[PDB]
RNA sequence: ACCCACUCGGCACCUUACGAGAAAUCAAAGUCUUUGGGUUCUGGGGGGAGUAUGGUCGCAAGGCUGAAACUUAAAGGAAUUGACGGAAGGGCACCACCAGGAGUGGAGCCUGCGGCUUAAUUUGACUCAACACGGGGAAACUCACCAGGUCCAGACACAAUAAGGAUUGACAGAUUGAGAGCUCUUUCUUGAUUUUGUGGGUGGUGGUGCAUGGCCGUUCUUAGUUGGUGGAGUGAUUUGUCUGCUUAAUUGCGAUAACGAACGAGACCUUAACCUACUAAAUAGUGGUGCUAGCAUUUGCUGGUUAUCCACUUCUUAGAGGGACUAUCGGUUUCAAGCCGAUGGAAGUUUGAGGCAAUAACAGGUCUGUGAUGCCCUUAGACGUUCUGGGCCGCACGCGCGCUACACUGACGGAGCCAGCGAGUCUAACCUUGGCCGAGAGGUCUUGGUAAUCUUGUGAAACUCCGUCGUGCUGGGGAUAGAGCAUUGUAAUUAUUGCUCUUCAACGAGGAAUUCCUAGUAAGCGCAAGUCAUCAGCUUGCGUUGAUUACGUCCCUGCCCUUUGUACACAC
């Protein structure tokens, strides 16, 4: 009970948790106008039509549908 | 009955054996197998002559 | 010369304790803490050491006289209880022998050890009392080992961060064995459930079995063990608890400073034997037949049928019992306990076999059974847990338990007919009849059975009847290998297992040594249950066929009791 080498590199590299940035959900700034939309939500009715869904590149990933959501765009 | 008690230094085993009274058995044998009890006979008055009991 | 009674003086002896003594013992070792009859010599813990030195005697060997330095906590006496003895006397044991049987040790293989090897080949146990044992027949898990990867399941309470956000989880890319966001440029997401430091927990098949409980093995299958009150001794302690005889037995008969008891033995409790005696029973078996089969109708023999009848428990089952207590005779014995014969009896080696089983112990095994545990260690890239792979199976070699054999008291093929123990499917599929397919192993359909009703008369095997083989490692043996089929499993490759064909090795009865066993016992034979998804060459039982040789002994190995000796007591 004194043998430990750990030939692999130090693997304590726990994942990031969306480090504290500015206020999220950047809808728009409209002078006495309807707040227009950016990174618009997808077409699935399961979303509350106000949740800023992810869109990396020609694909959409849904946080609420954490396991099953894949569309070709 | 065996029991384990936990002290600061370890565990102590307690073993309690009770031999109860067979004359209290209320079930199964009422005495030990080797216990033989003799019934005392009742002495009777002699005769000294043949008599006939009258109806 | 003897025999009596004295007497004086000797060598002694027996008994007892007035006494004495540490006791052994002592008529002196008494008349000595109630200390004094006279007198000589000697000793002052153990060694060094009867040495050195001086003296003196002697031819010499040596004798007499005779230290110290230094060293040391005990040496020593007498007894007690044990243990031990190549001590004695009794009594015993096939874990001893005797006379034998079957064997093991020799071969191949299967398993467990050691060593070697390795990333790991996890580990405990090493004479009896470790090595087919941890119910340990490990493919994954088991698993504790090794190569790696996750996850926290770090409770609960103190400060920081902290809804202008504690911090959760992610498809797809890179990375990875890997559809593990494990992690990482990339964005989304639930929200106080957590994250970070702190105290403190938790888990641990991590250590200690020499810190423990319990349990188990062993001492030790033998018969032994202990109070009370009396007796003995200053005492430890002893007597009781024993000279003798008997029993398997501190079993009894008895003897007797012991009497009266307790545990162990026995008794006891299960199991196997007997019941034509009671209760019985379409979940077991019995008889004329209702019905229907064959040779056969003389007036029989051999079968099938639950709802077609009645009666029975001989046999089967179980409950209540009875039976055997050595019963009755003969012989023997302080003419007792008992033992030995013979006749009955199912049973006459406490009827056979078990279960249970003193005191006191062992630093025996086990912390890897336990959420049974004290202390120590680790505790978040943890020794937790889980996932994927391996290892526990590796092979120069040594050892133990075993399986198969070396053969015609046989091998092979065909034919016959036989048991007993036991198990079986519920939030999941067990034992599986029968029909059909297949050479075989196996595959398909449902009624059968949660069970004396169905597997299952478990139609087992050894075994008997005919054949083939013919003393040739041969048709003995079937190790080692090649090809294929199937089954179990998510997964079989360093072959799970079975089957078909082929391959056809040592082994020609085994050295020193050594094991078990006295009647349905050994041995042979197979069957069922255990662990079992699959795997028995292993165990726990069961039944089938069923020898030799003993009815003893203490020679070897031990055991119990007594006596004895001991410089032993961590006890030869």
Swiss-Prot record, chain A:
Descriptive protein name: Small ribosomal subunit protein eS31
Quaternary state and interactors: Component of the small ribosomal subunit (SSU). Mature yeast ribosomes consist of a small (40S) and a large (60S) subunit. The 40S small subunit contains 1 molecule of ribosomal RNA (18S rRNA) and 33 different proteins (encoded by 57 genes). The large 60S subunit contains 3 rRNA molecules (25S, 5.8S and 5S rRNA) and 46 different proteins (encoded by 81 genes).
Modified residues (Phosphoserine): 43
Compartments it resides in: Cytoplasm
Lineage: Eukaryota, Fungi, Dikarya, Ascomycota, Saccharomycotina
Residues of the whole record sequence present: 80 to 152 of 152
ZnF (C4-type) ranges: 42-65
Organism: Saccharomyces cerevisiae (strain ATCC 204508 / S288c)
Covalent cross-link (Glycyl lysine isopeptide (Lys-Gly) (interchain with G-Cter in ubiquitin)), residues: 28, 34
Entry superkingdom: Eukaryota
From Swiss-Prot, chain B:
Name assigned to this protein: Small ribosomal subunit protein uS3
Biological role stated in the UniProt entry: Component of the ribosome, a large ribonucleoprotein complex responsible for the synthesis of proteins in the cell. The small ribosomal subunit (SSU) binds messenger RNAs (mRNAs) and translates the encoded message by selecting cognate aminoacyl-transfer RNA (tRNA) molecules. The large subunit (LSU) contains the ribosomal catalytic site termed the peptidyl transferase center (PTC), which catalyzes the formation of peptide bonds, thereby polymerizing the amino acids delivered by tRNAs into a polypeptide chain.
Modified residues (Phosphoserine): 51
Quaternary organization: Component of the small ribosomal subunit (SSU). Mature yeast ribosomes consist of a small (40S) and a large (60S) subunit. The 40S small subunit contains 1 molecule of ribosomal RNA (18S rRNA) and 33 different proteins (encoded by 57 genes). The large 60S subunit contains 3 rRNA molecules (25S, 5.8S and 5S rRNA) and 46 different proteins (encoded by 81 genes).
Cross-link Glycyl lysine isopeptide (Lys-Gly) (interchain with G-Cter in ubiquitin) mapped to chain: 30, 42
PTM characteristics: Ubiquitinated at Lys-42 in response to stalled ribosomes. Ubiquitination leads to activation of the No-Go Decay (NGD) pathway and degradation of non-functional 18S rRNA: first monoubiquitinated at Lys-42 by MAG2, followed by formation of 'Lys-63'-linked polyubiquitin chains on monoubiquitin by HEL2 and RSP5.
Gene: RPS3
Note: Present with 146000 molecules/cell in log phase SD medium.
Localization per Swiss-Prot or TrEMBL: Cytoplasm
Species the sequence originates in: Saccharomyces cerevisiae (strain ATCC 204508 / S288c)
Similarity comment text for this entry: Belongs to the universal ribosomal protein uS3 family.
